[PDB]
From a paper:
Anion Exchanger 1 (AE1) is an elevator-type transporter that plays a key role in acid-base homeostasis of erythrocytes. AE1 mediates an electroneutral anion exchange by counter-transporting one Cl– ion against one HCO3– during its transport cycle. Human AE1 contains 911 residues which are divided into two domains: an N-terminal cytosolic domain (CD, residues 1–347) and a C-terminal transmembrane domain (TMD, residues 371–911), joined by a flexible linker (residues 348–370). Similar to other facilitated transporters from the SLC4 family, e.g., the human electrogenic Na+/HCO3– cotransporter 1 (NBCe1) and the fungal borate transporter Bor1, AE1 operates via an elevator mechanism, in which the transporter switches between the inward-facing (IF) and outward-facing (OF) states by an elevator-like motion of the TD relative to SD.
Numbering used by the authors:
A (entry chain C), B (entry chain B): 371 to 743, 751 to 894
C-alpha cells in the first residue's frame, strides 16, 4: 500500500481500487445500533470543538472567520470525505495548530497591510498545487518512515493536550465565578455574565464529574457480566449518550443556577458581512493584492501542508493499525488529496482548511469497535456514521433549541472521558504505568521479557523527554515549529537510538504491530 | 462455646479462661502501622456519630442529655470494654434504636409526670439485674439459634440504614441552603446560619464525593500492583485518614464558603446544669420517684435489655464468624455482661447505655484484617486499638482546635464508604447481585451448583421481603419494636422455610460457614 508503484498517481488509483469495491458493504455495515450510538457521540464530540475554535478564531481574526464558517466547512468537508474517502472513519475538523497558524497569519497580514482572507485564498491555491504534485509522485510513501515511536508520541501528546485543555476550561470557569462570601445580584447576563455568580463554578464541576463518572461506569458495564448479554452490550454502546442525557436533565431541573450552554449562530450567515462576502475574489477584496505576496504565499502553504500532512497521516496510521482489526484498508494518497484539496477549495470561499483529528478519529473508531469474548472481534467500518455526523454538524445551526439546553460542563466531562479512553491503546502509556508497577507485576509482552527493566525504563524516559520538549514548544510562542520537532523525532529513532540500544530491544519496543518478529 | 456448661456462670468463666492467655499477645500485636491507621479511622467513625446522636438527644430531651454526656459515656465504655472485653474488635457507641427509645421514654414520662433521668437510672438498675440473671442462667446459649439468615438480614439492614442516613443528611444540607438565584448576606452566622448560603450545599456535596472517591481509590490501591509492596500496604491501611486529611485541607484552603464544622463541647459539663447533676439519686432530683413507677420500670427495662442484647449478640456473631479468621476467639457471655453492666453504670451517672455498633464493629474488623496476595490471611487482635479509640474520643474536647476544622461532609462521605465496605462480606448482597447476573456467570459456590436458580432467587426474594418489612417497621413510629421483628426471622427459618425448601437447599443457602455442605 505505502510502497511506490513508480507510475504517476499510482498510489491514488491503488487506493481507489482497494477501497471502492467495498462501497456497497460500507453502506450495509452501517445498519446497527452501535452505529447510531457512535453517530450521537461523535456528533457531540465534533460539534463542541467546532464551536469553541470558531469562537476563538472569530475573536483573534476580528470575525473574518467565525463559528458559522467553521461549521459549514466542517459539514461540507466531512460529507465529501465520508462519501469519497479511503478511510471514512477519520473525522475532519479544526485543531489547535491550525488556529495558531491562522492567528499568526492574521497578525502578519495586519503588520504588512494585506487582506487576510485573500492571503488565505492564495495559500489555498498553493496547497492545492502542492498536494497535486505530492499525490502525483506518491509522496505519501514517506509515511512508512514514521515509526510507532512517532505515532505514539504524537497520540500521547494529543491526549495530554486534550485533558489539559479540559482542566484549563474548568479552571477558567472557577476563576470567572470564584467562591466568595458576597456577590452582586444585578449582574448583567448578556452576552455573558459580567461578574461572579453563586453556585456556578461548583455546579459546573459537579456536572462534569457526574457525566465523566456515568460514562466510565457505563463503559465498565458494557463488558461486565450483569444483565443479559445483548442488552448489556446495547446499553454500554449508548453509555456516553446516556450520561450526557442524565446530566443534561439534571441541569435542566436545576432552574435557579446559571451554567454556560452551547451557543450556535442564528443562521448560515458570514460572520463579518462588512469585512467579507460569501465568495472571496483572489485578485482582491477592496484593494489590489500584491504580486510579491501572492508569489510568496507558497511558504505559508508549505507550513500548512506540513501541519495537515503530519496530523492526517499519523491519524491514519494510528486508526489503521493491525491491532485495530481494520481489514478494508485505508488509502494514504486518496485521504491526503481529499483533505488538502478540499481545504484549498474552502480557502477560496474563506472557510478554514480542516485536517483529520487524532482524538475525534480514534473515538469514532473505538465507538464502532465491537470486542468479542478483551480482544477486538471486529470494527464496524462504514461511511454512514461520519456522513451523518457531518450532516448533523451542518444542521446544528438549525437545531438551536435543543443545543442551547446542553451545558458546557457535561461536554467537558465527556472530553475528559474521551482523552482517558483514547489513552488506552498507546504502548507508551502502558510503559509509563509499568514505571510504577514493580518488576514482578509487569505483563508478559515481547518488550517486557526481552528487555532489561532498566533499559526499557530508559526508553520510556527518552520518550517522556520528547513529550516534555514537544509540550514546551507548544506552549512557547513558536508553537508552529511543533510539526518540525515531531518530524525530528524520526531521526532520533532511526539514528540516535540504535547507538544507545541494541537492535533486538529496538525491535521489541518499537514493533510495527502487536506481534512477535 | 455456645453450649451450656450446666453450672451457673459457667459460660462466663469459660470465656474468661479462654481469653486470658492471649491477653499478653493482645498488647504485643498492637505494634504496627496498620494499628495506627485503624485507630484513626475508627476514631473518626466513632467520634462523629457520638456528637450527632448527642446533639439530637439534647434536642429531644431539652438538654437533659447532650453531647458531653455521650462523649464521656462512649470514652469510658470503650476503655472498660477494651480492658476486660472478650471481643476487643467490637466498638461500643450509640445507635439509632437507643435514641428512639430515649425519646419515646421521655414522651411517656412527660405523659405520666415523671423525671426522665431518674426513670433511666431505675431502668439501668433493672438492666443490670437482667444481665446478671441471664449470665447466671447461661441464656447466651440461645444465640446459637441465630443462623446466617437473621445475621445477614441484620447486617444488610444496618448498612442500608447507614447509606440512607448519609444521603438524608445530604438532602437536609441541600434543603437548608438551596441553590437560589439570590441570597441574603445579613444572615446571622451564630449559632448556625439563619438562612440559605451560597456554595455551601454544592461544596458539601463536592467534599463528600471527594472523600468517598479517595477512600474507594485507596482501597483499590492496596489490592493493586502499583508502588512497592510494603509501601502500598501502608498507604492502603491509612486510606480513610488520608482521604479525610485531603478533604479537610481542601475545605481549609477555601475561605469564603461555610461548611458545617464538627462541634465538640468546650468543657466537660452536664448538658443541662439545672436539670440534673453528675450523679442522679434513685429517689429523684426534684420529686420523689413513685413506687409504682420504679416497680413498672421492669417492663421498659425488659424492652431495653431485649434490644441491646439482640444488637450486641448479633454483632458478636458477625465479627466472630469462621470466615473472618478470628483465631483467638471471643465469648458471648462475658462481653454481654460487660456491655450491659457498664450501660447500667452509665445510667446511674445519667449517661445512656451504649451497645456495640454493627457497622463500626465490622469496619474495625476489616481495618485490622490482613489479606494475603483475595483472602483473609489473618486478623490482628489487639486490645490497644479500641482503647486508643476510646482515649481519643475522651480527648476530643481537648482537641477542639483541630477537630473543629473537620466538615460534616467529609464524615458523611466516610460513612457512605463505611456502609459500602460493610456490604462486601454479606452473602445476601452476593445473591442480590446474582439476581442480575445471567446464570452462566454465577460463581462456583455451594448454593449455586447445588440449588436450582429459581429456588435460590425465591430464597433471595423472601430475604428481601423480610428486609422490606424491617425497613417499614423502622420508618413507622413502631421503630422500637424493630428488634422483635428481627428476632421473628428465627421462627421463620426454623418453621416456615423448611416447608418450602428441602433440607439440602437450606444447607447450601444458609451454611453457617464456608465449608462443604
Ligand atoms: C513514591 C514512589 C514509591 C517509592 C519508590 C522507591 C523505590 C522502590 O521502592 O522500588 C521497589 C521496587 C523494586 O522491587 P523490590 O525488590 O523492592 O520488591 C518488589 C515489590 O516492591 C514488593 O516488595 C514485592 O512484591 P509484593 O507486593 O510483595 O508481591 C516483591 O518483593 P518480594 O516479594 O521478593 O519480597 C517485589 O516485586 O520497584 C518498584 O516497585 C517501583 C516503585 C515505583 C518507583 C518510583 C516511581 C516514580
Ligand atoms: C431489566 C432486567 C433485565 C431484563 C429481564 C429479562 C432477563 C431474561 O429474560 O433472562 C435472560 C437471562 C437468562 O439467560 P439466557 O440463557 O437466556 O442467556 C444468557 C444471556 O441473556 C445472553 O443471551 C447470552 O450471554 P452472552 O451473549 O454470552 O454474554 C447467553 O445466552 P447464549 O450464549 O446461550 O445465547 C446467556 O448468558 O437471565 C438473566 O441474565 C437475568 C437478568 C436479570 C433478571 C432480572 C433481575 C431482577
Ligand atoms: C476534589 C476537588 C474539589 C474542590 C474543588 C476546588 C475548589 C477551590 C476553589 C477555590 C476558590 C476559588 O474560587 O478559586 C478558584 C481557583 C483560583 O481562582 P482565584 O482564587 O480567583 O485565583 C485566581 C486569580 N485570578 C482570578 C486573577 C485568575 O481556581 C482553581 O484552579 C480552582 C480549582 C478548580 C479545579 C478542581 C478540579 C477537581 C477535579 C475534578 C475532576 C472531575
Ligand atoms: C451523589 C449525588 C447526591 C445527590 C443528592 C442531591 C440532593 C438534593 C436533591 C434535590 C431536591 C432537594 O433536596 O431539594 C433541595 C433544594 C430546594 O428546592 P427549592 O424548590 O428551591 O426548595 C426550596 C427549599 N426547601 C426545600 C426547604 C423548601 O433543591 C435544589 O435546588 C437543589 C439543587 C439540586 C442539586 C442536585 C445535584 C445532583 C448531582 C448529581 C451528580 C453527581
Ligand atoms: C468586522 O471587521 C472589521 C474590520 O474591517 C475588516 O477587516 C479589515 C482588516 C479589512 O479587511 C477591512 O476591509 C474589513 O472590513 C471590524 O471593525 C474594525 O474595528 C477595528 C477596531 O476593533 C478598527 O480599527 C477598524 O477600523 C474597523 N474596521 C472597519 C472596516 O470598520 C469589525 O469590528 C468586525 N466585526 C463586525 C461584526 O463587523
Ligand atoms: C433545662 O431544663 C429546664 C427544666 O426542664 C428547661 O426549662 C430548660 O430549657 C433546659 N435547658 C437549659 C439550657 O437549662
Amino acid at each position: 500500500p505505502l510502497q511506490q508503484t513508480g507510475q504517476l498517481f499510482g498510489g491514488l488509483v491503488r487506493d481507489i481500487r482497494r477501497r471502492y469495491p467495498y462501497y456497497l458493504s460500507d453502506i450495509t455495515d452501517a445498519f446497527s445500533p452501535q452505529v447510531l450510538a457512535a453517530v450521537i457521540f461523535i456528533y457531540f464530540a465534533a460539534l463542541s470543538p467546532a464551536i469553541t475554535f470558531g469562537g476563538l478564531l472569530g475573536e483573534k481574526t476580528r470575525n473574518q472567520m467565525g463559528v458559522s464558517e467553521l461549521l459549514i466547512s466542517t459539514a461540507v468537508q466531512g460529507i465529501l470525505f465520508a462519501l469519497l474517502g479511503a478511510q471514512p472513519l477519520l473525522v475532519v475538523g479544526f485543531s489547535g495548530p491550525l488556529l495558531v497558524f491562522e492567528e499568526a497569519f492574521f497578525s502578519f497580514c495586519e503588520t504588512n497591510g494585506l487582506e487576510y482572507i485573500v492571503g488565505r485564498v492564495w495559500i489555498g491555491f498553493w496547497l492545492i498545487l502542492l498536494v497535486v504534485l505530492v499525490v502525483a509522485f506518491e509522496g505519501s510513501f514517506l509515511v512508512r518512515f514514521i515509526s510507532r515511536y512517532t505515532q505514539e508520541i504524537f497520540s500521547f501528546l494529543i491526549s495530554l493536550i486534550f485533558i489539559y485543555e479540559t482542566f484549563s476550561k474548568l479552571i477558567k470557569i472557577f476563576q470567572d465565578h470564584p467562591l466568595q462570601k458576597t456577590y452582586n445580584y444585578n449582574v448583567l447576563m448578556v452576552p455573558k455574565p459580567q461578574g461572579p455568580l453563586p453556585n456556578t463554578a461548583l455546579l459546573s464541576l459537579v456536572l462534569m464529574a457526574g457525566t465523566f463518572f456515568f460514562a466510565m461506569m457505563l463503559r465498565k458495564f458494557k463488558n461486565s457480566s450483569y444483565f443479559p448479554g445483548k442488552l448489556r452490550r446495547v446499553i454500554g454502546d449508548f453509555g456516553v449518550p446516556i450520561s450526557i442525557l442524565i446530566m443534561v436533565l439534571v441541569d435542566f431541573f436545576i432552574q435557579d443556577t446559571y451554567t454556560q450552554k452551547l451557543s450556535v449562530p442564528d443562521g448560515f450567515k458570514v460572520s463579518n458581512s462588512s469585512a467579507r462576502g460569501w465568495v472571496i475574489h483572489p485578485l482582491g477584496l477592496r484593494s489590489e493584492f500584491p504580486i510579491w505576496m501572492m508569489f510568496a504565499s507558497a511558504l505559508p502553504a508549505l507550513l500548512v501542508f506540513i501541519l495537515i500532512f503530519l496530523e492526517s497521516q499519523i491519524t491514519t496510521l494510528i486508526v489503521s493499525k493491525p491491532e485495530r482489526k481494520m481489514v478494508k484498508g485505508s488509502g494514504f494518497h486518496l485521504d491526503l488529496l481529499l483533505v488538502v484539496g478540499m481545504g484549498g477549495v474552502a480557502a477560496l470561499f474563506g472557510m478554514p482548511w480542516l485536517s483529520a483529528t487524532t482524538v475525534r478519529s480514534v473515538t469514532h473508531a473505538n465507538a464502532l469497535t465491537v470486542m468479542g469474548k478483551a480482544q477486538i472481534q471486529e470494527v464496524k467500518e462504514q461511511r454512514i456514521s461520519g456522513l451523518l455526523v457531518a450532516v448533523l454538524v451542518g444542521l446544528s445551526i438549525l437545531m438551536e433549541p435543543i443545543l442551547s439546553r446542553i451545558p458546557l460542563a457535561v461536554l467537558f466531562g465527556i472530553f475528559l472521558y474521551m482523552g482517558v479512553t483514547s489513552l488506552s491503546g498507546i504502548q507508551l502509556f502502558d510503559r509509563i504505568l509499568l514505571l510504577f508497577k514493580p518488576p514482578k507485576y509487569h505483563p508478559d509482552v515481547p518488550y517486557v521479557k526481552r528487555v532489561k527493566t532498566w533499559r526499557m525504563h530508559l526508553f520510556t524516559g527518552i520518550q517522556i523527554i520528547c513529550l516534555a520538549v514537544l509540550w514546551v514548544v507548544k506552549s512557547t510562542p513558536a508553537s508552529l515549529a511543533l510539526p518540525f520537532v515531531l518530524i525530528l523525532t524520526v531521526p532520533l529513532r532511526r539514528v540516535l537510538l540504535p547507538l544507545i540500544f541494541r537492535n533486538v530491544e529496538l525491535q521489541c519496543l518499537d514493533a510495527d504491530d502487536a506481534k512477535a518478529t
